A paper describes a structure:
Repair of Iron Center proteins (RIC) form a family of di-iron proteins that are widely spread in the microbial world. RICs contain a binuclear nonheme iron site in a four-helix bundle fold, two basic features of hemerythrin-like proteins. [name] has an L-shaped two-domain architecture: it exhibits an N-terminal ScdA_N domain connected through a highly flexible penta-peptide to the C-terminal four-helix bundle hemerythrin-like domain containing the di-iron site. Altogether the data so far gathered for [name] such as the induction by NO stress, the interaction of [name] with Dps and proteins of the iron-sulfur biogenesis system, the iron donor properties of [name], and the ability of [name] to promote the formation of an iron-sulfur center in IscU and ferredoxin, all indicate that [name] is a bacterial iron donor.
Our previous studies indicated that mutation of E159 to leucine in [name] affects the formation of the iron center. The mutated protein no longer exhibits the EPR signal associated with the di-iron center, and the structure contains only one iron atom in the metal site (see below). The E159L mutation induces instability in the overall structure as judged by the higher atomic displacement parameter values when compared to the wild type [name]. Moreover, the iron is weakly bound as deduced from iron release kinetics data. Substitution of E159 by leucine caused the side chain of H129 to change its position towards the protein surface, thus impairing the coordination of the second iron atom. This might suggest that the movement of the H129 side chain is concomitant with the release of iron from the di-iron center through the hydrophilic channel. The presence of a di-manganese center improved the overall quality of the crystals with the diffraction data measured at 1.9 Å resolution. Still, in this structure, designated as [name]-159LMn, coordination and ligand distances were maintained. Data showed that the wild type protein has a higher affinity to the two metals than the [name]-E159L mutant. When compared to the wild type, the iron release rate of [name]-E159L is approximately 7-fold higher and that of [name]-E125L is ca. 8-fold lower.
Author numbering: 2 to 220
Write the structure that this text describes.
């Protein structure tokens, strides 16, 4: 039964299961070791319904399965698909949020504090991604991953802090749902936020659930 499998393994094996877990606000990225059963119980969800939704998704194999891919290919993919994108996405969202918080300051639904939280995420993620690209990822490419417990534990602590920031961003934005009086800039910014959350969760998932454990295992 899918409920007895870890969230991370389900997300990495079933196409769009990541999107299903995002719908249910289950942390498959930094909390990807927990079983679906445990995650669903904490959130008081009907786990049979979720198993049926996963079964329908699992009719196809995942288009690209990273679980057994070479660690160097995973690293190069992370840098181009996630690190480079975050470095473009977040400055753009910071400026959009600034504009929304000023233009709609008088409105009740305006996401006050959003700029602040995006800025914190950008600063913390920027420094973090530089340390991966300059220290940890080269160490893994050199074959020293089995010696990386310390560095990986530091990176995984930052992942938890990034997850905390994501929760604050989601709360500030009514789970990234714009109000009815949202103009196009506001709505477009929320689409960008959802894209950032989707990407960052898949990115952390690939590191926590594939790259880091396999590196430590000597692969
Ligand atoms: Cl969860
Ligand atoms: Mn990374
Ligand atoms: Mn990372
Ligand atoms: O990251």
């Amino acid at each position: 039964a899918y409920r007895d499998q870890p969230l991370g393994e389900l997300a990495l094996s079933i196409p769009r299961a990541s999107a299903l877990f995002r719908k249910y606000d289950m942390d498959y990225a930094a909390g990807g070791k927990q079983t679906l059963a445990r995650a669903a119980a904490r959130k008081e969800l009907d786990v049979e319904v979720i198993e049926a939704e996963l079964a329908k998704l699992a009719e196809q194999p995942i288009e690209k399965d990273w679980r057994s891919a070479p660690l160097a290919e995973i690293i190069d993919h992370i840098i181009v698909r996630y690190h480079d994108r975050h470095r473009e996405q977040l400055p753009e969202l910071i400026l959009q949020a600034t504009k929304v918080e000023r233009v709609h300051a008088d409105k009740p639904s305006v996401p006050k504090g959003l700029t602040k939280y995006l800025t914190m995420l950008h600063e913390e993620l920027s420094s973090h991604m530089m340390k991966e690209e300059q220290i940890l990822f080269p160490m893994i490419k050199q074959g020293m991953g089995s010696q990386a417990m310390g560095p990986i534990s530091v990176m995984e602590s930052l992942h938890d802090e990034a997850g905390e920031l994501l929760e604050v961003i989601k709360h500030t934005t009514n789970n990234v749902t714009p109000p009815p009086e949202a103009c196009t800039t506001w709505k477009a910014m929320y689409n960008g936020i959802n894209e950032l959350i989707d990407d960052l969760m898949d990115h952390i998932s690939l590191e926590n659930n594939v790259l880091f454990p396999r590196a430590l295992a000597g692969e």
